[PDB]
């Protein structure tokens, strides 16, 4: 029917300071239908201990979810959010940029 | 608290 592909933002709860514990967030929104798969990645590897918010939706009926996990950023570790949805032919990977 | 009489469409 109507299908809407997810918007994705990857960011931290607090401003990033290397060596200080923080939370890594992947906010997925604007999507329909509601079935979605999200992984948070560290240096390409799936983080196992990832929690998510309860499924809700916006006034235009599109769904949104927050996936988050504790992390301690460093200069050289890389982090990302990997999302699959029926509207995507292959998973979409969005890398964490601490300036965004 | 919720409405208790949601009807069938």
């Amino acid at each position: 029917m109507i299908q809407r592909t997810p918007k994705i933002q990857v960011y931290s709860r607090h401003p990033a300071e290397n060596g200080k514990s923080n939370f890594l967030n992947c906010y997925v929104s604007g999507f329909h239908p509601s079935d979605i798969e999200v992984d948070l990645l560290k240096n390409g590897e799936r983080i196992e201990k990832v929690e998510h918010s309860d499924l809700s939706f916006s006034k235009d009926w599109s769904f949104y979810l927050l996936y988050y996990t504790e992390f301690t950023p460093t200069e050289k570790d890389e982090y990302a959010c990997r999302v699959n949805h029926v509207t995507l032919s292959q998973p979409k990977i969005v890398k964490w940029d601490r300036d965004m | 608290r919720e409405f208790s009489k949601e009807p069938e469409l």
């Binding site: 960011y11 906010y27 | 608290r1 208790s4």
Partner: protein
């Protein structure tokens, strides 16, 4: 000073993988306070904010029973909808609904809501008069005719004008230290060179509640709407929200640009510039 309570229902069919899953979440303003999931091990209405935990066992039993009954009602609704659109039993479909009340600073009803969507498309809605329906198509007219015959709107009206407002006012008082506390944004401007010729100025708003905010860039006092990249407001995970707005500026013209911030928590709107 104005507030809302909303409940959000989602039912999703999954032929060959059991019966349709039913989820409810409840919000006061931008704060989720209750959830229910029929796929939970022992489905029950569960608290998600501290100020609702004080409700007694009778509250939680009634809320749970309502959600368990809704799980079955929405499964019947989905079967009816499949027929109304001549659809196969093989496909997955989604039924969503939202209802609730808005209240002003004096605690009086501003308006009520109850609307539905099928497969992401508006289906039927209670009008602002709380007495009549707007149906999106000839399938929804079947629902309308059935709800007109059963005088469903009168039941909703009684709920939205009474219980909904009175329980919202209860929650607002029980959670006043958070629900009636506006946390202002912490704001700063960052500068990101792109080339020898231009750079990005990014205006940040962090740690604010509620989510409603206005972030705009001006150049020489005129708004740069078409040239501003505005990200969707996003949850930080600690109840607060984040947002930023960015503009691409020619090298050396940074001081012609001003960032402007409006939020309920601010004594006065803010005007910010790049401070090298």
């Amino acid at each position: 000073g104005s507030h809302s309570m909303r409940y959000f229902h989602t039912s999703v069919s999954r032929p060959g993988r059991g019966e349709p899953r039913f989820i409810t979440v409840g919000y006061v303003d931008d704060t989720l306070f209750v959830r229910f999931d029929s796929d939970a091990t022992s489905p029950r209405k569960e608290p998600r904010a501290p100020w609702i935990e004080q409700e007694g066992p009778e509250y939680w039993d009634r809320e749970t029973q309502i959600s368990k009954t809704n799980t079955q009602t929405y499964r019947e609704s989905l079967r009816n909808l499949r027929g109304y659109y001549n659809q196969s039993e093989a496909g997955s479909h989604t039924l969503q609904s939202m209802y609730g009340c808005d209240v002003g600073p004096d605690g009086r009803l501003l308006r009520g809501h109850n609307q539905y969507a099928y497969d992401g498309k508006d289906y039927i809605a209670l009008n602002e008069d709380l007495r009549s329906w707007t149906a999106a198509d000839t399938a929804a007219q079947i629902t309308q005719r059935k709800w007109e015959a059963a005088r469903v709107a009168e039941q909703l009206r009684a709920y939205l004008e009474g219980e909904c407002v009175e329980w919202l006012r209860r929650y607002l008082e029980n959670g006043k230290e958070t629900l009636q506390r506006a946390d202002p944004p912490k704001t700063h401007v960052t500068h990101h060179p792109i080339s020898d010729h231009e750079a990005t100025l990014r205006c940040w708003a962090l740690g604010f509640y509620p989510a409603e905010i206005t972030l705009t860039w001006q150049r020489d006092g005129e708004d740069q709407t078409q040239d501003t990249e505005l990200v969707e407001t996003r949850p930080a995970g600690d109840r607060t929200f984040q947002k930023w707005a960015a503009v691409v500026v020619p090298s050396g013209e940074e001081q012609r640009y001003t960032c402007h911030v409006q939020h309920e928590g601010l004594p006065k709107p803010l005007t910010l510039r790049w401070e090298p």
